[PDB]
Amino acid sequence: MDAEGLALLLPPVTLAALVDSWLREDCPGLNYAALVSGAGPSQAALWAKSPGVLAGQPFFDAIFTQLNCQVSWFLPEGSKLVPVARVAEVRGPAHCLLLGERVALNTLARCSGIASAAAAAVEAARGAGWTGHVAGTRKTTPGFRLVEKYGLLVGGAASHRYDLGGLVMVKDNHVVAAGGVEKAVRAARQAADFALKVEVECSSLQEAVQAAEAGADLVLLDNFKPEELHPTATVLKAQFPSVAVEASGGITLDNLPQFCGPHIDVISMGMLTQAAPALDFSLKLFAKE
Amino acid sequence: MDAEGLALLLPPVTLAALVDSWLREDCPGLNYAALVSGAGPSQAALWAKSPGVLAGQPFFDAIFTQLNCQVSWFLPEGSKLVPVARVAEVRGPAHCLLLGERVALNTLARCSGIASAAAAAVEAARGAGWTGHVAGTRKTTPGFRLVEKYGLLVGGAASHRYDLGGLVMVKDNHVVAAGGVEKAVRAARQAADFALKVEVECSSLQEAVQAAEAGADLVLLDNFKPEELHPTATVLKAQFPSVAVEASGGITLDNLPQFCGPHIDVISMGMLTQAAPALDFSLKLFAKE
Amino acid sequence: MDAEGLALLLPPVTLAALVDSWLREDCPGLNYAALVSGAGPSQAALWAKSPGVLAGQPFFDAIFTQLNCQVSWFLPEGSKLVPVARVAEVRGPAHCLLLGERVALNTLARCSGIASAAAAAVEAARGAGWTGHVAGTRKTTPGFRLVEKYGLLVGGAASHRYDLGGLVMVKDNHVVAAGGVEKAVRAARQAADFALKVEVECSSLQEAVQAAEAGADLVLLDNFKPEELHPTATVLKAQFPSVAVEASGGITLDNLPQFCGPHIDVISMGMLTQAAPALDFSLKLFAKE
Amino acid sequence: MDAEGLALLLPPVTLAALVDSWLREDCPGLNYAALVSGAGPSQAALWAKSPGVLAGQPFFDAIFTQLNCQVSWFLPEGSKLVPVARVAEVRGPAHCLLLGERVALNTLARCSGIASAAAAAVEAARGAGWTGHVAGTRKTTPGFRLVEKYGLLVGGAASHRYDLGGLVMVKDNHVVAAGGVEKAVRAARQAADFALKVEVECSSLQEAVQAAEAGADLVLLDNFKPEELHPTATVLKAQFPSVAVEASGGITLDNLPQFCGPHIDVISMGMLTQAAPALDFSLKLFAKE
Amino acid sequence: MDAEGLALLLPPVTLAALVDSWLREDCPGLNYAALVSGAGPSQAALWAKSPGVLAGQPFFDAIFTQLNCQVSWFLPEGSKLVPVARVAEVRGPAHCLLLGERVALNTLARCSGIASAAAAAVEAARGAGWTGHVAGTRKTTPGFRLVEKYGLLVGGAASHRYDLGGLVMVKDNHVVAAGGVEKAVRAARQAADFALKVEVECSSLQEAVQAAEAGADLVLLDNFKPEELHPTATVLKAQFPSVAVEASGGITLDNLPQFCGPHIDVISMGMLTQAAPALDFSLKLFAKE
Amino acid sequence: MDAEGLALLLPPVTLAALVDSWLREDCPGLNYAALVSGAGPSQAALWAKSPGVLAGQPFFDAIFTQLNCQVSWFLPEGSKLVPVARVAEVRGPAHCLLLGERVALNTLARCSGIASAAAAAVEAARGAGWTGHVAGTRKTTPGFRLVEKYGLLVGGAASHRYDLGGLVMVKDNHVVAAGGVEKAVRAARQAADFALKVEVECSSLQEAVQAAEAGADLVLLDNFKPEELHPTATVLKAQFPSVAVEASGGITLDNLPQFCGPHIDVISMGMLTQAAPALDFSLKLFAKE
Ligand SMILES: O=C(O)c1cccnc1C(=O)O
Ligand SMILES: O=C(O)c1cccnc1C(=O)O
Ligand SMILES: O=C(O)c1cccnc1C(=O)O
Ligand SMILES: O=C(O)c1cccnc1C(=O)O
Ligand SMILES: O=C(O)c1cccnc1C(=O)O
Ligand SMILES: O=C(O)c1cccnc1C(=O)O
């Protein structure tokens, strides 16, 4: 995509409600440190001290806008961060900058760190000649989904489904509960009348074929070794060429290339959200003359 | 210090609210996946697949209570996870179990992941002879502070001030805006009447002394090499024996012992929250009764 | 669709919150008519005074639950209503029973009113030997969508996309804004990726082909006369067998049979929500043994 | 009355909140369709496609304001709508115009639908030479009451009580629970100390006299056939000239002239909110010259 | 009446919501104090240390119910408090009792203090032979109206009009805005269609008469000396026998009998809410024997 | 203090939330009174009818801002009010001023009442040559703590800790629950890692010392007569120089000077918030073309 146009995804109602809560979480009562700085007009520089990808400007902006501060970016959303970079400047009343400071920073650090891993992982795949979509999961922080999924998009990963209402994903537990894969997929297909796709976690070739026969649009190959994964995917694409194939389970940055192959459409990774460290940013006030 | 007594810190109102919003994030509309599993009474086993410390039972319990499911814990809050362990059992209607599965796991993974890092770091400190307090920061995920600060406790580090509303904290930025460290602290110390303490970030011996003279209860030595840090702290404690010394900036699990000396009372670490990977948990239905 | 299992689609959090907002709407302050009834143990009987389909038990139930009342139903959810029928008995404190009454009845009235129309539309389509799906739209009352979309399902219609983060729908205005049907569907598919279906509104056969060619999952044939619809449908189906066709616009109970064909998969009708008179119900306290 | 000044009744806080819940209902997560339109400065025409009364302007406006879009109206609120008329022009970014489209349309459709049905009933009553008040009920869609009551006022009906903290209304059930009309009215008058009126639903002449005697500000005649209603009213009016008489139950636009008569003061009709079809409108983007 | 049956006025939704804000206000973060008491099953005695009237049981209860505690009342709601009285007893986990303490005490203290003041006023009114209704105002604490108005009622005063939603009160300002008293009342009367009473603030016998002629249901005689009030009110009743006559403005508990007279129906008092000191209660843990 | 620079303490999100709830409480539905005044541009004078200290401008401003109304203050926050003052002017639509009026007046009155009470007290203390802190308590009206604690500051008192997660307070009850003072304070000390202070309620010199020995930062001497208080305090300060001493319990404005001795640091007064009458203010519409 283009990372600058991604911001248009964020609906501005649910956005400001997020921002409000984040501020309240941090300053529920009186802001005593306000008195230290006073409210004089001020400027601070946003320092990027970690390599990766910048993401999260829409969140960073919104937070400060709520506090009557203005942000000037010196890079675009999505651009590569080359450490000790001065990536932006923030102007407003001192106390307002310093109240927004930590929250904006945390939001930007986390969003960026996710985008960073996603870009790293996308590269590694491109590098192995893979043409598919590296994806995320629902293994997001609670109440932080919007920021994390958006982060994955800025990094060039696909978001995967956002909600639980958005694609019907039959998993091991759904199959156990429904008493077998055929039964499960039949129900799943009925519930997704014509508007929603069905995906089915399958731990074996058999489970997959059963799923694919039953009319699954996607078959997720969960926890296969690579040497098992590709022959299994080959059989599937051969027999059901219109069915998409996702590999997930245990997949990391280091090993990702082994999971890439001509018959895998999607690779999903817990790690992009669950084990992607936050980038180091600071926001420092500089004096005017 | 009992880690099972820690759930009492959680006020039940802010807890049940948080849980609602987590579930609403994940499934705002219709849960089509309820139709695949139906609603038969079922049981699921919680499996820990990562080493660390188990943290977040109160949140796990709340999530599932909200969905009319019950939880039996086989290990106490804060115990070591020795992997491929069966840590607990969850009971309830199938569709209800599966609705809360991900959000619960996410929450538990995230909280446990932090506890583990805190525990690692506390152990490191103990191992380097040091009886001070290892601590968190305000570098927490937005909307998720309660879980992360609670996690820090369960792992046995200190939370630090929760929310900018406890302790008053003067930083590089407050000093710049106030036109001096002398001015900044006097203002800070006026604001925090008797109820609140004043801590000051300082980047030199000089700036520390000025702070302590000015009436600082705590003096944070920001971003020192340990070779500078300890001589500095030695003088401070000589000249102002009742002023506490915190050290912060660049402190990893790797180098933490280097910042563990006899005149350092608090060590705060960004990494305990920012860069602690989540633990791997799963929740698998079984068909006993 | 077994209509009694549909209640499993209702996540219990968003439900309970919605119930709260309805009761607060109807009684923001003090309930003065509490004093008129007092709080004597009491029982009322719900009478269905209109013909159609009973829908809304979950909502009815959950309103009374919030006011310590209990409901016992004598008809199953989705059953046929033959007038002057006793469908349930609600038991609880008089004042509570009387507080919930209008809100609970108003909820059951539209939900049933909508289901009734859906059932009638489905019946006319089965009646013209159509094996397709009758569907709702996003033409729903603001804030009431959960009840209305559930209503359609209980009457045997498809809900279409609930959401707008569900299926990606390119409409007449999108096509304009984009700058052409070709350029728009390219951009839709890219946003949709593997996770979502792209549906496109099309005013002619030419626009439909352009669309199918750009990779549309569903072509929606907007405001065609029946004489023009079916030729156009037959063409798309011969040339792109894997694309689903939707007819929509101007469709009524009376004319629906003329829109049924062997090459229409979905027919959506705005009237099913926008013009479905609410059923007559009432709740009258009786005396007990 | 002036229909344009009714907007003053709408307190801008409850209006804005209401709008946000509607917006959030339609797009809880990510707006994928933003990418198809993009953010081009754009303009749309509001086409009125059904006959009736225009109502809902202040809500329509509020919605788009919340998305940074400006509305310009060509008909004033309350004017007669003559089909295929251009009533307004909405401008702003393309993605925003399309985000608010369906919600704003759905709001205006239903408010106008009601206004029309009220105006229609007001007209037939005027046509019978009746000078009383046609009225709404509390039979409103849950959560949508502010819009529906307002629609009644624009069509020139009277909203009954909005609220329930409103007028005190003693109904058949209140009378049953109390054990007797005179008891009930005593209790109701006590609760309505001097600030509220007391109304009593009465199913006979005998009960209506009991209630009038006991001091009710109004007597509602609950299901009378018209041949019975007017003698019962006449007797009431002669015996208690300062009591007001409401006729309710079964009153359709077709039979309304028969319920009009010199001794009825208020005629409340459930149909106005429960069975008023919504109007047809559409919002189509045009390019400028 | 019966102060015990007043609790039925409080709808359980808006209670629990109110109680939740109050608790959140007091402990928005982690409750560190809970670790000092631990969770031992405990009991505590509520001690009334001031003279007055007890009011606020429903709130006190709700608060502790939310914290899983239970309350046994030794005196009924509305009874006379003779100091150092042991009025109730509260049981539940120690940290829960202690978390609820202050918030519940503050609530009961203020409700009780208002009911005391209202009683005092109702007494003096009765003592002076007057059969009217002492009333309060909209001079309530912001967001504490439910409790304050409830207190008035328990004290035996009237809750003058709760919300601005059910009576229509024309004031000095409304008249100025409207450009005269005739105009204002005329307008008000048309706004309050048949459901709502109109009250008019009048500062002179003229302005009162004018309002009465225009159709005012009540005439409020504002800031009159008593020697002016009673002649003014006698003319009023002479000409307008069915128009209620309220007196207001600087009426204190001391002079209240001077404002009592056969022609005054209602007496509102700012002081019942604005200057009613809180009672002194305390909650003391004891060991069981 | 500098009373004008105190507004900076008020975070703008929590402020605008609070203000919305006040407005929603006072007019949840339709504002019939808007029709009486119309929307004409108007102005209103704010009159101060009582002596005291002016407090609550930020809340006042925010309230009106929310209703598109501007305020011009002719007196700085916290100035002395000398009665019949014209302290400010409010411009806006007529219906908007009148909707805001009472809510804002109510806020300003109780904020100003408290500031006044506190100024009275701080004055007597400064008059008694005392250099310590006059403080508040947590005996604040529920849901209104921000306004009341802010008012205390403006009048020159200290807020004290605001909520239960500032300083950690051990009271009679915490001691009972812990089974002793030693145990309770150790637990509070362990809980208050380094971020917080521990304060202990003590009813005797011995208990004060046990607390001081166990590491208490402050010792609150509850309910001592002045004759006991000072000699107790003189001993503490001798034997534990850096422990602070707060007196509290029964300290009226009248007797306060008796509590102002050289070994007392803090004096807390329940009365400042529990028994401080609100000041008298009106807002009157005046003329302009
Ligand atoms: O549920 C998902 O959306 C999902 C998609 C791909 C891989 N894992 C998951 C998961 O959360 O378990
Ligand atoms: O603000 C804090 O509480 C804090 C405390 C210790 C270390 N870092 C921080 C920070 O957020 O920068
Ligand atoms: O958007 C939809 O879901 C939809 C689907 C089919 C027909 N109309 C609509 C509409 O709301 O206009
Ligand atoms: O209650 C009302 O407001 C009302 C007013 C007139 C007629 N019916 C009703 C009703 O809801 O039953
Ligand atoms: O507002 C009221 O209803 C009211 C009623 C009686 C006395 N004062 C008032 C007031 O203006 O606050
Ligand atoms: O608890 C407090 O914060 C407090 C502090 C000082 C004086 N009183 C109190 C109280 O409300 O009991």
Q: What is the DSSP letter of F112?
A: H
For residue F89, the cross-strand partners are: F45, F72
Inter-residue contact E234 to E243 (CB < 8 Å): no
Residue E269 tokens read as 């008092």
Q: How far is the CA of C227 from the centre of ligand 1 (A)?
A: 46
Q: What is the distance between the alpha carbons of residues B268 and B136, in angstroms, rounded to a whole number? A: 5
Nearest to D142 among C27, C31, C103 (CB): C103
Q: What is the distance between the alpha carbons of residues D161 and E192, in angstroms, rounded to a whole number? A: 10
- 55-74 in A: which are within 8 Å (CB) of F? 66-67
Q: How was this structure determined?
A: X-ray
Q: What is the distance between the alpha carbons of residues A104 and A99, in angstroms, rounded to a whole number? A: 9
Tell me if F36 and E170 make a contact (CB, 8 A cut-off).
Answer: yes
| E-contacting chains (≥3 CB pairs under 8 Å) | A, B, C, D, F
3-state secondary structure of E265: coil
The position carrying tokens 């408090």 is E81
Q: What is the distance between the alpha carbons of residues C61 and C92, in angstroms, rounded to a whole number? A: 12
Q: State which residue of chain D sits closest to E193, comparing Cα positions.
A: D158
Task: Tell me whether residue E180 is exposed, middle or buried, using C-beta atoms within 10 angstroms of its C-beta: 0 to 12, 13 to 18, 19 or more.
Answer: exposed
Backbone phi, psi, residue B69, to 5°: -130, 150
Q: What is the distance between the alpha carbons of residues A199 and A170, in angstroms, rounded to a whole number? A: 6
Task: Specify the residue with its C-alpha closest to ligand 6, atom 9.
Answer: F137
3-state secondary structure of C139: coil
3-state secondary structure of B192: coil
Please list every residue in chain C followed by a chain break, i.e. its C lies more than 2.5 Å from the next written N.
none
Nearest to B193 among F158, F193, F195 (CB): F158
| Number of Cβ atoms within 10 Å of the Cβ of A3 | 19
A231 to B120, D143, D214: CA distances (angstroms): 42, 56, 88
Inter-residue contact C132 to C265 (CB < 8 Å): yes
Cα dihedral sign for C192, C198, C203, C205?
Answer: positive
Q: What is the distance between the alpha carbons of residues C152 and C276, in angstroms, rounded to a whole number? A: 11
Around ligand 5, the residues with Cβ closer than 6 Å are: E 137-139, 160-161, 169, 248, 268; F 102
Same domain, B105 and B206: no
Query: E259-287 burial, b if ≥16 CB within 10 A, otherwise e?
Result: bbbebbbbbbbbbbbbbbbbbbbebebee
Q: What is the distance between the alpha carbons of residues B181 and F214, in angstroms, rounded to a whole number? A: 33
Distance to chain C for A157, nearest Cα, Å? 11
Which one of C193, C240, C243 makes the best mutation probe of the A interface by having the most chain A beta carbons within 10 Å?
A: C193
Distance to chain E for C230, nearest Cα, Å? 54
Q: What is the distance between the alpha carbons of residues C157 and C176, in angstroms, rounded to a whole number? A: 31
Inter-residue contact B109 to A274 (CB < 8 Å): yes
Same domain, B89 and B151: no
Question: What is the total residue count of chain A?
Answer: 289
D24 to A14, A144, C143, D172, D236: CA distances (angstroms): 7, 16, 9, 39, 51
E170 to A10, A23, C56, E165, E196: CA distances (angstroms): 46, 41, 44, 13, 13
Q: What is the distance between the alpha carbons of residues B150 and B158, in angstroms, rounded to a whole number? A: 9
SS (H, E, C) chain D: CCCHHHHHHCCHHHHHHHHHHHHHHHCCCCCCCHHHHCCCEEEEEEEECCCEECCCHHHHHHHHHCCCCEEEECCCCCCEECCCEEEEEEEEEHHHHHHHHHHHHHHHHHHHHHHHHHHHHHHHHHHCCCCCEEECCCCCCCCCHHHHHHHHHHHCCECCCCCCCCCEEECHHHHHHHCCHHHHHHHHHHHCCCCECEEEEECCHHHHHHHHHCCCCEEEECCCCHHHHHHHHHHHHHHCCCCEEEEECCCCCCCHHHHCCCCCCEEECCHHHHCCCCCCEEEEECCCC
| Number of Cβ atoms within 10 Å of the Cβ of B31 | 26
* Any E CB within 8 A of D227 CB: no
Catalytic site residue from C80, C139, C183, C225: C139
Q: How far is the CA of D168 from the centre of ligand 3 (A)?
A: 42
Tell me if C190 and A1 make a contact (CB, 8 A cut-off).
Answer: yes
Residue C48 tokens read as 């269905």
Same domain, C95 and C76: yes
Q: How far is the CA of C139 from the centre of ligand 3 (A)?
A: 7
Q: What is the distance between the alpha carbons of residues C179 and C187, in angstroms, rounded to a whole number? A: 11
Residue list, annotated binding site of F for substrate: 102, 137-139, 161, 171, 201, 222, 248-250, 269-271
**CATH number for position E204:** 3.20.20.70
Residue type, F56: G
Nearest to D195 among E1, E166, E193 (CB): E166
The CB of C169 under 6 Å from ligand 3? The reply is yes
Same domain, C164 and C236: yes
* Bridge pairing between strands C80-81 and C133-135: unpaired
Same domain, D153 and D254: yes
Q: What is the DSSP letter of B50?
A: S
Residue type, F268: S
Inter-residue contact B211 to B185 (CB < 8 Å): yes
Residue F239 tokens read as 């034997």
Task: Give the angle A69-A71-A75 at the CA atoms, nearest 5°.
Answer: 170
**CATH number for position F38:** 3.90.1170.20
- 15-54 in E: which are within 8 Å (CB) of A? 28-29
Q: How far is the CA of C280 from the centre of ligand 4 (A)?
A: 14
Distance to chain C for F66, nearest Cα, Å? 21
Same domain, A175 and A286: no
Same domain, B64 and B160: no
From A202, B106, A5, select the one nearest D94 (Cα to Cα).
Answer: A5
Same domain, C120 and C256: no
Same domain, A148 and A178: yes
From F280, F25, F264, select the one nearest F144 (Cα to Cα).
Answer: F25
Q: What is the distance between the alpha carbons of residues D229 and F9, in angstroms, rounded to a whole number? A: 66
Q: What is the largest CA-CA distance in chain C?
A: 73
Task: Tell me whether residue B127 is exposed, middle or buried, using C-beta atoms within 10 angstroms of its C-beta: 0 to 12, 13 to 18, 19 or more.
Answer: exposed
Same domain, B235 and B198: yes
Same domain, A69 and A82: yes
Inter-residue contact B31 to A165 (CB < 8 Å): yes
- 258-277 in E: which are within 8 Å (CB) of D? 265-266
The CB of D169 under 6 Å from ligand 4? The reply is yes
Query: A52-75 burial, b if ≥16 CB within 10 A, otherwise e?
Result: bbbbbbbbbbbbbebbebebeeeb
Write out the H or E segment, with its range, that includes residue B92: strand B85-93
Q: How far is the CA of A215 from the centre of ligand 1 (A)?
A: 20
Tell me if A158 and C196 make a contact (CB, 8 A cut-off).
Answer: no
The position carrying tokens 């016998």 is E205
Residue type, F109: A
Same domain, B138 and B79: no
Backbone phi, psi, residue C64, to 5°: -70, -35
Q: What is the distance between the alpha carbons of residues F281 and A155, in angstroms, rounded to a whole number? A: 58
The alpha carbon of B192 is separated from its chain's Cα centroid by a whole number of angstroms, namely 25
The range of the structural domain enclosing residue B173 comes to: 130-275
- Structurally, how many domains does chain D consist of? 2
Inter-residue contact A60 to A107 (CB < 8 Å): yes
The position carrying tokens 């999530």 is B63
Q: What is the distance between the alpha carbons of residues A129 and F111, in angstroms, rounded to a whole number? A: 69
* Bridge pairing between strands A198-202 and A218-222: parallel
Inter-residue contact C32 to D196 (CB < 8 Å): yes
Tell me if F177 and E38 make a contact (CB, 8 A cut-off).
Answer: yes
Residue E167 tokens read as 């009576």
Task: Specify the residue with its C-alpha closest to ligand 1, atom 6.
Answer: A137
Active site residue F139: yes
Q: What is the distance between the alpha carbons of residues F77 and F150, in angstroms, rounded to a whole number? A: 12
Complete DSSP assignment for A73-136: ESS-TTPEE-SSEEEEEEEEEHHHHHHHHHHHHHHHHHHHHHHHHHHHHHHHHHHTT--SEEE-
Residue B187 tokens read as 């203002």
